[PDB]
């Protein structure tokens, strides 16, 4: 279901937004989860360019620089 599928998000910063914050932060902290951003909500929170639209030229150029030489 849509409300159920929304539960799973790689980025924990994103999840801490719309879900129950207290649980998400703990549950992420124990796993040592590393949030790479990569999404809209997270980049909105952290306050940088959205990985879409005009910013899609930025995040892409940076995405390929990552996991590479």
């Amino acid at each position: 279901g849509i409300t159920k599928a929304s539960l799973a998000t790689e980025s924990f910063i994103s999840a801490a937004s719309f879900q129950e914050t207290t649980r998400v932060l703990t549950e992420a902290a124990v796993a040592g989860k590393r949030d790479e951003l990569r999404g809209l909500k997270e980049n909105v929170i952290v306050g940088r360019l959205i990985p879409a639209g005009t910013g899609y030229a930025y995040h892409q150029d940076r995405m390929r620089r990552r996991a590479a030489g």
Partner: protein
Amino acid sequence: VDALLDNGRRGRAITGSNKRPLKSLADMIKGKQGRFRQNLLGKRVDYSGRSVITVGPYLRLHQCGLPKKMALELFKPFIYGKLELRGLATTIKAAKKMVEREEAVVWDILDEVIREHPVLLNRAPTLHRLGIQAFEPVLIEGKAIQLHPLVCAAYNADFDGDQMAVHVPLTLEAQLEARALMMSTNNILSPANGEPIIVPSQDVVLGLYYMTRDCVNAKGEGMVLTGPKEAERLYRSGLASLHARVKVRITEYEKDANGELVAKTSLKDTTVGRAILWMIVPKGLPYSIVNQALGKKAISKMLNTCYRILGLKPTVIFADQIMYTGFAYAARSGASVGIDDMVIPEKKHEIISEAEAEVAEIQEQFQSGLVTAGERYNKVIDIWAAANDRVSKAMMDNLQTETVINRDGQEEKQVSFNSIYMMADSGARGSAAQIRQLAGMRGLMAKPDGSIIETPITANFREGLNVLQYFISTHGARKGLADTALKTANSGYLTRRLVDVA
């Protein structure tokens, strides 16, 4: 320590001398209003403003009226910089002193910084992306924001005192984003479906509808004209009536060659109004589109076809001209509403009486026991419903076709020119249901339980409603407001779940 980190999982300690429990670090992180982290519920923003909104029909669709003082305060830093760049102000301090004094020279500088600089306009219930649209600012004396009429549909903005907020795009990238993306002219079509959201709303469509329509006999009936020019000239001089059946020569175009516009001319059977209106329609569109009665749907499909043929710009300026002419001619038309514009069926009371006979029939049967109580209930409810249907389909015939008018003979009858009918028919405003509530009887109400009352409202709004009838209508009203105001919230929640999942 627990109380410090997250309070409330043990004892909920209270702050000194104050009963209300003290906010812990967990509560600092969580925030309130459900889940909102200050990037969510919202964030206050500089270079912004807002106010009550007005019409501004003079505007092209790409612009909006922006109050003077508002523009001054909003663009204040730009103004400071533009003032001392031209050297009118020694230093930034002096610039402040100048704009604070509102010296005569600053207004021109403001006209300089305003020109190619777009502004973002937003309304309260933002749902779809069209909730925010970029406009070219036009300096206006007043405290009210002027917003182009064709955009009113996108904002769902009434004129009853709704407010709009302005945001100044600051960085170059923001200006160019606003102009190439959020710009009004760049969104003519709903992202949900390819149909135009720029569709003419109410007054304009009553204008184009009144324009192209035909009565039976009118000034200039049957004559012939060289082209739309002398048609309009025939009209404005009072010689020919706006609506009359007339043959006129027109030149239409078809791009149906390869990327190329073919020309063809002919004598079309049309009216004076349609001929006049044709002057506006650009290029490759066939005369077929303006030769109809021009309802809201047709007036929309005109725009749509124009866009799917000629491209963007012609469609933009087309819509603009359509708005201007719709308003102007609707104004000329002298459309109004009186108490006598709403026509009740003469046969109404008789329908009421017969349908009232049926209930005493079934009542007599329940008295004699031929039928059960519930079966009776269904029977009476059915006869009253049938009654309402009959009165509605009476007043609809009488309202719609009753114009009975003579051309060279004794009698002929056509679709009515009555105001309220034209309004309901064009799609401008009103509908068969509401008009039905005006002339014909209104409905059968239902208790909050949902058990529908077997004594319907016999009276209408043109007549009076008495005490009981009104009291019974009141529940329907209150439940209406409640349900709608609730479905707003449900809508929001739903969209929220949606963007969360996407």
